[PDB]
Structures are given as C-alpha cells and as structure tokens.
Design a protein around this ligand. Sequence first.
Ligand SMILES: CC(=O)N[C@@H]1[C@@H](O)[C@H](O[C@@H]2O[C@H](CO)[C@H](O)[C@H](O)[C@H]2O)[C@@H](CO)O[C@H]1NC(C)=O
Length: 138
Amino acid sequence: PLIVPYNLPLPGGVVPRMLITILGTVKPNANRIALDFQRGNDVAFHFNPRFNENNRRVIVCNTKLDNNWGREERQSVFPFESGKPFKIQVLVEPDHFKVAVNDAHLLQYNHRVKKLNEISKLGISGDIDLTSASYTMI
Ligand SMILES: CC(=O)N[C@@H]1[C@@H](O)[C@H](O[C@@H]2O[C@H](CO)[C@H](O)[C@H](O)[C@H]2O)[C@@H](CO)O[C@H]1NC(C)=O
C-alpha cells in the first residue's frame, strides 16, 4: 500500500499511448477523490469524483492555469462506491485523456495544456486506500 496523497512521477511527461492504472478502495463515507496531472504549478487535468455535492454524486474535471480554475466539465455517470475497490485507467490519446473505471469507458477530456511532455507528475489524493499506481505503454 501507498501513502495518500501520493505523487507518481511521469518521467519525460505524458505521451500518447501511455496508460496510467490506479487501483484502490474508496473509504467508507468518502467525500472526494482527486487525480491531478501537473505541469509545474499548473493542473493540466484534474479528475474529481465528488460523493456529496448538494446530495448529488458528480465527477468534476478541469484545468488550473496560473492558480485559476477554468471551465468545469461535469459527468453525472458515477462508477465509484463508498467502501468498494476500484480501478481507474487513464489512456493518453493525441487529443484527450480517456478515462475508464472498472473496465468501462467513463469520459474523455480534451487537452487544454498542450505541452504533453511537460506534464510530469500525477497527484493522487482523497478518500481512498491506494493499492497501486503505475504506468505502461500500449
Ligand atoms: C457548482 C459549481 O460550479 N461549483 C464550483 C466548484 O466546483 C468550485 O470548486 C473547485 O472546483 C475545482 C475544479 O473546477 C477544484 O475541484 C477545487 O478543488 C474546487 O474547490 C468552486 C471554486 O473554484 O466554485 C464553485 N462555483 C461557484 C459558483 O461557487
């Protein structure tokens, strides 16, 4: 097991065909999970399952540039459950991050930060027990 928050270095940045796999279990009565793909202080892709935003479960995705959050992209399909093991796979494609949860496609996020090679770390945080975080090329 890994200590949360966990920083996964992405040496030389991300590139198309890189697959990141995250295995963990959601804590009971979780509030949030977050993945933050970083370019220095900037957040290229923030992926943020929220378990109780005004008694709704929602995934919020966004980009933070110069300390400012941009336009949120919201997904109401919510495959995480409190107390239960999950797998998140993030596949870098030429034009977007593609995210699957428990083997099922969830969402795509168009690249707003376009210097992919500068996206050099992934932060994993939130209400989880983290089992594994790794990457491979497909
Ligand atoms: C309903 C709505 O628009 N709520 C937003 C919050 O989502 C937003 O929260 C911040 O969201 C960013 C990602 O976009 C990130 O998850 C931060 O950790 C989180 O604090 C908040 C502040 O940017 O703004 C709310 N908007 C309003 C109108 O208050």
